[PDB]
C-alpha cells in the first residue's frame, strides 16, 4: 500500500453480513467476500487528479509468502469453462465489467496476469471513481487458489507504467459470502 502524490486509495460500499448479498466488504479485516462472477464496485479516491494517460491495474497475488511466488490463475476446471465476455482470456481471474477499453496483460518476466483500465476522474456529483470487478474462480478450487487466501493489488500508474500509487485488499470468492464474513469476522 502507498498513497502517492495523488492520495490514491480504495473505497467500498458497506453492504452488511446479511444474506442474499453476493458481495460484501469487511472494513476490520479489510477483506472482501463475494460470489463468483458477481460485480464488486470498488472505489478509487484521489486528493489530486493523476496526469492524462494514467492507468489502473488490478493484479491478484497470494497472501501467504509461502505461495507468494506462484501466479494466481483460474483452476483447470474454470479454465475450460465457456463463460467469457469476449475480452478476458480464459485463464484470468480478475475481469473488469462496464469499461469498454480494458486491457488484459501477462508480464513477460513474472507471468502474472492483470487487468488495466484508463483512470477516469469522478463523474460530476461523485467524490470517487468506480470500477466494477469480478472474480471467476472460487478461493476453494482445487488446481486453483485451493483454499489459499489472495490479495488484490490495485495500482495507479502513469501512461508509461511508472507506479503512481498502490493499495490492496484481501479477497475471498465463495458461494456463502455473508456467512463467511461474520463467521470470520473475529
Ligand atoms: Zn475455479
CSV table of C-alpha atoms and ligand atoms in Angstrom, one decimal:
chain,number,residue,atom,x,y,z
A,1,UNK,CA,0.0,0.0,0.0
A,2,UNK,CA,1.1,3.6,-0.7
A,3,UNK,CA,-0.9,6.7,-1.4
A,4,UNK,CA,1.3,8.9,-3.6
A,5,UNK,CA,1.2,12.5,-4.7
A,6,UNK,CA,-2.4,11.9,-5.5
A,7,UNK,CA,-3.6,10.3,-2.3
A,8,UNK,CA,-4.6,7.2,-4.1
A,9,UNK,CA,-6.7,4.8,-2.0
A,10,UNK,CA,-9.6,2.4,-2.3
A,11,UNK,CA,-13.2,2.7,-1.1
A,12,UNK,CA,-16.0,0.2,-0.6
A,13,UNK,CA,-19.8,0.2,-0.4
A,14,UNK,CA,-20.9,-1.0,3.0
A,15,UNK,CA,-23.4,-3.9,2.4
A,16,UNK,CA,-23.6,-6.0,5.5
A,17,UNK,CA,-23.1,-9.6,6.6
A,18,UNK,CA,-26.8,-10.1,5.6
A,19,UNK,CA,-27.9,-12.9,3.3
A,20,UNK,CA,-28.8,-12.9,-0.5
A,21,UNK,CA,-25.9,-10.4,-0.6
A,22,UNK,CA,-23.4,-11.5,-3.3
A,23,UNK,CA,-20.6,-9.1,-2.3
A,24,UNK,CA,-19.7,-7.5,1.0
A,25,UNK,CA,-16.6,-5.7,2.3
A,26,UNK,CA,-15.2,-6.1,5.8
A,27,UNK,CA,-13.6,-2.9,7.0
A,28,UNK,CA,-12.0,-4.6,10.0
A,29,UNK,CA,-10.4,-7.5,8.1
A,30,UNK,CA,-10.1,-5.2,5.0
A,31,UNK,CA,-11.2,-8.3,3.1
A,32,UNK,CA,-13.9,-8.7,0.5
A,33,UNK,CA,-16.2,-11.7,0.3
A,34,UNK,CA,-18.0,-12.1,-3.0
A,35,UNK,CA,-19.8,-14.7,-5.0
A,36,UNK,CA,-18.0,-16.0,-8.2
A,37,UNK,CA,-18.8,-13.9,-11.3
A,38,UNK,CA,-20.6,-11.1,-9.5
A,39,UNK,CA,-19.7,-7.5,-9.8
A,40,UNK,CA,-17.8,-5.7,-7.0
A,41,UNK,CA,-17.9,-1.9,-7.1
A,42,UNK,CA,-14.6,-0.9,-5.7
A,43,UNK,CA,-13.9,2.8,-5.4
A,44,UNK,CA,-10.9,4.9,-6.4
A,45,UNK,CA,-10.0,8.0,-4.4
A,46,UNK,CA,-7.5,10.8,-5.0
A,47,UNK,CA,-6.7,14.2,-3.5
A,48,UNK,CA,-5.4,15.4,-6.9
A,49,UNK,CA,-6.2,14.0,-10.3
A,50,UNK,CA,-3.5,11.9,-12.0
A,51,UNK,CA,-2.0,13.1,-15.3
A,52,UNK,CA,-3.7,12.1,-18.5
A,53,UNK,CA,-2.8,8.6,-19.6
A,54,UNK,CA,-2.6,7.3,-16.1
A,55,UNK,CA,-4.0,3.7,-15.8
A,56,UNK,CA,-5.5,1.5,-13.1
A,57,UNK,CA,-4.1,-2.1,-12.9
A,58,UNK,CA,-5.7,-4.9,-10.9
A,59,UNK,CA,-3.5,-7.9,-10.0
A,60,UNK,CA,-4.1,-10.9,-7.7
A,61,UNK,CA,-1.3,-12.3,-5.6
A,62,UNK,CA,-1.1,-14.9,-2.8
A,63,UNK,CA,-1.4,-13.5,0.7
A,64,UNK,CA,0.9,-16.1,2.4
A,65,UNK,CA,4.6,-15.5,1.5
A,66,UNK,CA,5.0,-19.3,1.1
A,67,UNK,CA,2.9,-19.1,-2.1
A,68,UNK,CA,4.0,-15.5,-2.9
A,69,UNK,CA,5.9,-16.7,-5.9
A,70,UNK,CA,3.0,-18.5,-7.6
A,71,UNK,CA,0.9,-17.0,-10.3
A,72,UNK,CA,-2.8,-16.8,-9.4
A,73,UNK,CA,-4.8,-18.2,-12.3
A,74,UNK,CA,-8.2,-19.9,-12.7
A,75,UNK,CA,-8.3,-23.7,-12.0
A,76,UNK,CA,-8.1,-26.3,-14.8
A,77,UNK,CA,-11.9,-26.5,-14.4
A,78,UNK,CA,-13.0,-22.9,-14.8
A,79,UNK,CA,-10.2,-22.5,-17.4
A,80,UNK,CA,-12.2,-24.9,-19.6
A,81,UNK,CA,-15.4,-23.1,-18.7
A,82,UNK,CA,-17.1,-21.1,-21.5
A,83,UNK,CA,-18.1,-18.0,-19.6
A,84,UNK,CA,-16.2,-15.3,-21.3
A,85,UNK,CA,-17.2,-11.8,-22.2
A,86,UNK,CA,-15.1,-11.6,-25.4
A,87,UNK,CA,-12.3,-9.7,-23.8
A,88,UNK,CA,-10.8,-11.5,-20.9
A,89,UNK,CA,-8.6,-14.6,-21.7
A,90,UNK,CA,-9.9,-17.9,-20.3
A,91,UNK,CA,-7.1,-18.0,-17.8
A,92,UNK,CA,-7.6,-14.7,-16.0
A,93,UNK,CA,-9.1,-14.5,-12.5
A,94,UNK,CA,-9.9,-10.8,-12.3
A,95,UNK,CA,-12.1,-9.4,-15.1
A,96,UNK,CA,-13.5,-5.9,-15.4
A,97,UNK,CA,-17.1,-5.1,-16.3
A,98,UNK,CA,-18.6,-1.9,-17.7
A,99,UNK,CA,-15.4,-0.5,-19.2
A,100,UNK,CA,-15.1,-0.6,-23.0
A,101,UNK,CA,-11.4,-0.3,-23.0
A,102,UNK,CA,-9.9,-3.0,-20.6
A,103,UNK,CA,-6.5,-4.4,-21.3
A,104,UNK,CA,-5.6,-8.0,-20.2
A,105,UNK,CA,-1.9,-8.5,-19.7
A,106,UNK,CA,0.6,-11.1,-18.7
A,107,UNK,CA,4.0,-9.9,-17.6
A,108,UNK,CA,6.8,-11.3,-19.9
A,109,UNK,CA,9.1,-11.8,-16.9
A,110,UNK,CA,6.7,-12.5,-13.9
A,111,UNK,CA,4.0,-14.3,-15.9
A,112,UNK,CA,1.5,-12.6,-13.6
A,113,UNK,CA,-1.9,-11.6,-15.0
A,114,UNK,CA,-3.5,-8.2,-14.7
A,115,UNK,CA,-6.4,-6.0,-15.9
A,116,UNK,CA,-5.6,-2.4,-16.7
A,117,UNK,CA,-8.1,0.3,-17.4
A,118,UNK,CA,-7.7,4.1,-18.1
A,119,UNK,CA,-8.0,6.2,-15.0
A,120,UNK,CA,-11.1,8.5,-15.1
A,121,UNK,CA,-11.9,11.3,-12.7
A,122,UNK,CA,-15.1,11.0,-10.8
A,123,UNK,CA,-18.3,12.0,-12.7
A,124,UNK,CA,-20.0,15.2,-11.6
A,125,UNK,CA,-21.7,14.8,-8.2
A,126,UNK,CA,-19.4,12.0,-7.1
A,127,UNK,CA,-16.3,12.2,-4.9
A,128,UNK,CA,-14.8,9.0,-6.1
A,129,UNK,CA,-14.5,6.9,-9.3
A,130,UNK,CA,-15.8,3.4,-9.6
A,131,UNK,CA,-14.6,0.3,-11.3
A,132,UNK,CA,-16.6,-3.0,-11.4
A,133,UNK,CA,-14.5,-6.1,-10.9
A,134,UNK,CA,-15.3,-9.8,-10.9
A,135,UNK,CA,-13.6,-13.0,-9.8
A,136,UNK,CA,-14.0,-16.0,-12.0
A,137,UNK,CA,-12.7,-18.8,-9.8
A,138,UNK,CA,-13.6,-19.7,-6.2
A,139,UNK,CA,-11.0,-19.5,-3.5
A,140,UNK,CA,-11.8,-23.2,-2.8
A,141,UNK,CA,-11.0,-24.5,-6.3
A,142,UNK,CA,-8.5,-27.4,-6.5
A,143,UNK,CA,-5.8,-26.7,-9.0
A,144,UNK,CA,-6.6,-23.1,-8.5
A,145,UNK,CA,-6.2,-21.0,-5.3
A,146,UNK,CA,-7.1,-24.2,-3.5
A,147,UNK,CA,-8.2,-22.6,-0.2
A,148,UNK,CA,-5.2,-20.3,-0.2
A,149,UNK,CA,-6.1,-16.7,0.5
A,150,UNK,CA,-5.3,-14.0,-2.0
A,151,UNK,CA,-4.8,-10.2,-2.0
A,152,UNK,CA,-6.0,-8.0,-4.9
A,153,UNK,CA,-3.4,-5.3,-5.7
A,154,UNK,CA,-4.8,-2.1,-7.3
A,155,UNK,CA,-2.2,0.2,-8.7
A,156,UNK,CA,-2.5,3.6,-10.3
A,157,UNK,CA,0.3,4.1,-12.9
A,158,UNK,CA,1.2,6.7,-15.5
A,159,UNK,CA,1.0,6.2,-19.2
A,160,UNK,CA,4.4,4.6,-19.3
A,161,UNK,CA,3.9,2.2,-16.5
A,162,UNK,CA,5.5,4.1,-13.6
A,163,UNK,CA,3.9,3.5,-10.2
A,164,UNK,CA,1.8,6.5,-9.1
A,165,UNK,CA,0.0,4.9,-6.1
A,166,UNK,CA,-0.9,1.5,-4.7
A,167,UNK,CA,-3.4,0.0,-2.4
A,168,UNK,CA,-4.7,-3.5,-1.7
A,169,UNK,CA,-7.3,-5.7,-0.1
A,170,UNK,CA,-7.6,-9.4,0.7
A,171,UNK,CA,-10.4,-11.2,-1.1
A,172,UNK,CA,-12.4,-14.4,-0.8
A,173,UNK,CA,-14.6,-15.8,-3.5
A,174,UNK,CA,-17.2,-18.0,-2.0
A,175,UNK,CA,-20.8,-19.1,-2.5
A,176,UNK,CA,-21.6,-18.0,1.0
A,177,UNK,CA,-20.0,-14.5,1.4
A,178,UNK,CA,-22.3,-13.1,4.1
A,179,UNK,CA,-22.0,-16.1,6.4
A,180,UNK,CA,-18.3,-16.2,5.6
A,181,UNK,CA,-17.8,-12.6,6.5
A,182,UNK,CA,-19.3,-12.8,10.0
A,183,UNK,CA,-18.1,-16.4,10.7
A,184,UNK,CA,-14.6,-15.0,10.1
A,185,UNK,CA,-15.2,-11.5,11.5
A,186,UNK,CA,-13.4,-12.0,14.8
B,1,LIG,ZN1,-12.2,-22.4,-10.4
